[PDB]
Design a protein around this ligand. Sequence first.
Ligand code: SF4
Ligand code: SF4
Ligand code: SF4
Ligand code: SF4
Ligand code: FES
Ligand SMILES: [K+]
Ligand SMILES: [Zn+2]
Lengths: 207, 106, 48, 126, 84, 690, 114, 96
Amino acid sequence: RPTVRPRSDVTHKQLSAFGEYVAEILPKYVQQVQVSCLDELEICIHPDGVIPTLTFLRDHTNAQFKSLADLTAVDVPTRQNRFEIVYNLLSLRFNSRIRVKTYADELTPIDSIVSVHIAANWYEREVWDMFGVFFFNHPDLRRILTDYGFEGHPFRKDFPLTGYVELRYDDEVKRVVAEPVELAQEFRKFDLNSPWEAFPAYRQPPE
Amino acid sequence: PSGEERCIACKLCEAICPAQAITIEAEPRADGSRRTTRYDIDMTKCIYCGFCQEACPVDAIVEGPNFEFSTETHEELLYNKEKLLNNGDKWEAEIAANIQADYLYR
Amino acid sequence: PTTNPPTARKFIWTNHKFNVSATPEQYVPYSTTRKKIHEWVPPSTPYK
Amino acid sequence: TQLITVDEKLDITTLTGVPEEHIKTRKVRIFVPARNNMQSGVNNTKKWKMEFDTRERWENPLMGWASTADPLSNMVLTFSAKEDAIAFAEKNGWSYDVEEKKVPKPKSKSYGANFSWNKRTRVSTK
Amino acid sequence: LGLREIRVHLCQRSPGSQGVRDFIVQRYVELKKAHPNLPILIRECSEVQPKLWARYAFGQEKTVSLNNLSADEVTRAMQNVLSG
Amino acid sequence: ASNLIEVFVDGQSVMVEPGTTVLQACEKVGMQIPRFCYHERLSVAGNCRMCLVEIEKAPKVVAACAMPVMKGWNILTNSEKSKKAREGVMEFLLANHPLDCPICDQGGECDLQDQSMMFGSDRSRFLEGKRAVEDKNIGPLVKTIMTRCIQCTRCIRFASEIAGVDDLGTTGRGNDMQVGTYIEKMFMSELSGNVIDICPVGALTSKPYAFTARPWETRKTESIDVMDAVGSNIVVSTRTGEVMRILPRMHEDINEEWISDKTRFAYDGLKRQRLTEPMVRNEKGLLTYTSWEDALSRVAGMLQNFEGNAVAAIAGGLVDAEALVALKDLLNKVDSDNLCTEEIFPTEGAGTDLRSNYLLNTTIAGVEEADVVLLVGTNPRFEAPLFNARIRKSWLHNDLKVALIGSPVDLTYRYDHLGDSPKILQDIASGRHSFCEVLKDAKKPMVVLGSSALQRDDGAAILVAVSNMVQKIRVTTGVAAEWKVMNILHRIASQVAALDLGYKPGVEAIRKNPPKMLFLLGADGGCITRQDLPKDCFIVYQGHHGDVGAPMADVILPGAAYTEKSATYVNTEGRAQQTKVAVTPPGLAREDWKIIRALSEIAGITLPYDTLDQVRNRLEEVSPNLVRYDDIEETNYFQQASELAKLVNQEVLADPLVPPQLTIKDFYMTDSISRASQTMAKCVKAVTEG
Amino acid sequence: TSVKPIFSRDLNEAKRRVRELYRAWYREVPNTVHLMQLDITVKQGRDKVREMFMKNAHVTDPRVVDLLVIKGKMELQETIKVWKQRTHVMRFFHETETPRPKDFLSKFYMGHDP
Amino acid sequence: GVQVSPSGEKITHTGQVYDEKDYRRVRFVDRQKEVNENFAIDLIAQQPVNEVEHRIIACDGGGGALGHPKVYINLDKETKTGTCGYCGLQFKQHHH
Ligand code: SF4
Ligand code: SF4
Ligand code: SF4
Ligand code: SF4
Ligand code: FES
Ligand SMILES: [K+]
Ligand SMILES: [Zn+2]
């Protein structure tokens, strides 16, 4: 089939075995281990075990994931803990990638892993700036991408696309001033959802 | 070639427009044909990606070869249907030749 | 376009115009809308 | 040592950065969206949408576009459960109106009723 | 001064509105015979307390809560509203 | 497991009733089988063949829309055989379907397009020429491009069963088989845009909604309907701050899936003849534009000048509960009880007092579960088309027995016309009738009295005669006392809310004591005019359309339309419902209760509400059922209302009562919006023309 | 009920942190006005600081008070540096925009807004 | 064909002219309001009707892929010519 990708069940099995390995090494923190059909290993842990899990994966002999590729957050505002913090880690020794997930809400911070990876400094600054997830023991935790006086965390789902304020030059005060946003166009939302389901494999059971 | 406008008010170019730069208000004409009354393209909002011209099913909207159309005011780059039809009438001797040279690839 | 002239059409501009910015012949946008709303006309006869 | 007793209602409106106008003078609607009657598909139901009350959209003097003044106009939020939507609205401090899911009623369907001997369900055209 | 309107808000299925229901079912008709120009609006709802509203001349409304009242005392309250 | 059978779909083990189809079992588990001709409110056709599914250990695919599950079946919805069947059927449809998708109207609304993308193949093997069918001229509402029809007979089944006109059908055989009328027929009935709804392809499109918008463009606001006291749920599809389309919603207890032609196509009137600025009389006597400050200052000055009985108010059809309680509070604060409605309800006995005396006590589900229905003095087809549609549905399925007292009008179903005279009510109450022996053989009686019948001079006499007949019916039959019999079918959206709020119905108080300051909350009916009014009388007209109440007004206050304000309306059942803001009112128009409150505070009336929620609290403290939205809570004390009516002594008139709505041409224009719409003008022109 | 604190066990030490932050802002206002050539006076800036604390002064959740203290410390840090400019520090005053009136008559005279 | 309003400004092919009292003509003061002279409705009205022989005629825009999607028009009504929906070309069956 020239239009469908190959599967690589061998690396799927390898990632499953390593998921069993990590889940039995750290039962105190690991809540779920899954391997996708795209051959990616995800380990979902309790927020209290971020430091031990990341330290184990940084320097364990069979699990050398010394390079932190990505640290991001996903706002799913329908679960109780609305932020899913995702760490994508790279193993140069074993040529592998792992994903570690934890959760947070607006009032539950997560311990920073700057003591484990130094890139987590700016990555956690970005997570705090864009989602409002505080990080314990972070050196100079502050905004990194928003404006200096910016209010609110714009990557949240409840934040508007255009924001609440906009800037313009005012000649009376001779400044760049902020005003409530007034669009001359009003971005048109499109309901691009077919009323027929596309993937029966993901059909949720009825409520 | 009869002179009738190619656009049939189907709006899928503004559906695919990644910058939302097109506004395609439309109504039936006096002869009952499905045509547009407002076709605005904000050239200060457009990203010049050609998605409209590759989405158009009748080759109505095109991105012709004119690039020396810089203006001295912001308003002159807010095109309407009259401006776009004037550009189509102005550049048809070149746009048609380019589409002739290009349409077998697309 | 002396050995291969373009296809002649009746709606093609016979005279080319250069960039007409900052000239009286420049382009000004409209709103081709026909107002979409007709308010009312009060009667010219007073009361009944 | 790490658990404290808090008897509040989980108010984060001082942290969200929303102006007080768009917190107090705002009405959100929590609802399963109605099936689009032009189609028979039902996949656009079964997710609880939260939307805001529609404000003024006036006409641009220059181009005739639809100008707006409120940012929470296209604020469709998706929730897997009505209680989750209620909790999110209460947490952000918006007044809400929630309406129940309108499931279609189960209906008795029989092909043989179209050819009844005495009932009025007999059709005159296939 | 000057009674203009009486409103009786009650519930259909509640133990607290039982006296109001009995009052309506036994002596509302004679009351309407006695005052055949006075609007006595009866409103029944699902989960409301028994309430009596007396609207007077310039919009003054007197509110009487009467949950868990029997027939004699609700008709005595009605006569109190009518007389003064 | 009494009369429950276990059936499997993809291994899941759902229990279903006997007679349940494969499609119903699959949707009970959660899977929607593809379909084109099946509709859950239409008879099973089984001709589109898109619902073919595989049963385990069965060599032949079965049509899920028609096949009932037997026992222990395993429905393999996602099997290779089912997917091949769906691909083949989709290929056969798209072989001769015309490639008209950009010039079409089902852009994102096409079931054919969506089911093609989800279940069909990605290519075509068709190397031949496609067929083409000449178009029809079925009416000014439904534009027929019949080349893209897929011969699914859904419109035929609808027009035969629900609309019941039997004008559509199939002519020809094979690939030449065509849908429509064989002759040049003007298919114009009420409930005729629902073929535009149920047609999955764009064969039957809306002519007023011709080429204006696309579904991905349209924002959808779920609201309710006015200009019909059924209060059907609708969706207003707007775009860029402009109402583009009115679609129906799904409420199984009010309107099911469809709406009527007037509510579907009367949105054109919302952009014609619209009050946009406040107006005052000039020194020359003409209406001229002014500001809100000046207009409300003049009204406040005259209101401070005039005392109680000299100030009166009349409320028309399209008025919300919030504005009604606002004007009631204002006039009560200036000590005025003259708060009248446009149409008349008899105030004798427990007229406005007991809520069971003026409601559809047995609901539309009551029509579903009744067995005999006696319609007195009404034309339900034009007064309440959804109510008549439910009567026909019960007549088809539950074998409902329908009788009519009044003029013989062409109701779709066949009824027993008992005659045209109000003496039949006394005849039935005494007991002399074939319908009386029908009633004594019956078990679920339901009588429906028309508000149009109440509009006569002997409205009180008609009401007491009907109530006495109800008492005789209830003592003759063994009714369970949870089953009501008496119902009143209103035709005015504001009427039930006004009666609940305590408005005195009818303008007879205005006739008895002519005021000097008059308020007209959209009072366009022409019941009160300057002839039977005194000289000046200071008329203010708060409304959205300038039709009849505006040209005779001293001041004009532009209010909001029902698509322009978040408002409350109570239907014939007594169910209160809320409409949302789809667009804002044009010009300087404002919301109606806001106008009244600003008037009071420019005057000296301290109205205790400031926001919409405070108006709702005022509505609750006046009658606490106007805030119970979508609640159908019961009434009682009909015995008390009946004996008060029996005390009331009137003689019924010997005039044969006829409904004002005898024909669909009279149906199409009823209110200000319908009179202002050009689409309804084209409808009455097409009906009246030969 | 039974939540995890972030800095403060209860409201008292949260108020202590609030007082420390307010002391720091009150001390920093004159230096800010002197360093960034602000049109305002020292009294106006301290009144603005009090206004911000007062508009945040209705919350009784210790975690929310701690997060407000943290965000105030961040804002104070970028005011201690000159990361915020004159425009950024004058955005607190809203000198350009006209406030929407709080009365029903004005909100009725202009706009369909509650 | 372009027309002139009593105010003086030209009328577009969708007639949208500003009124006498409309303030939005200062945008044309010392400038011009450009209207495309070639009205497509007139240009397609002056196109002749194609006489064809079959009951069903297929229409493109004049090229294999440079035209519009290929549609089919049914010329059963002798009273009116069949117009393709994409172009404005009219076809009539040569029944002689
Ligand atoms: S080229 Fe411009 S107008 Fe066309 S789709 Fe891209 S952004 Fe939109
Ligand atoms: S330019 Fe083309 S894609 Fe855009 S609306 Fe017109 S026909 Fe459709
Ligand atoms: S009905 Fe559907 S498939 Fe047919 S032309 Fe219209 S959009 Fe295309
Ligand atoms: S016109 Fe529409 S509803 Fe009627 S048979 Fe054809 S496809 Fe079906
Ligand atoms: S849905 Fe069953 S054959 Fe059409
Ligand atoms: K359709
Ligand atoms: Zn063509």
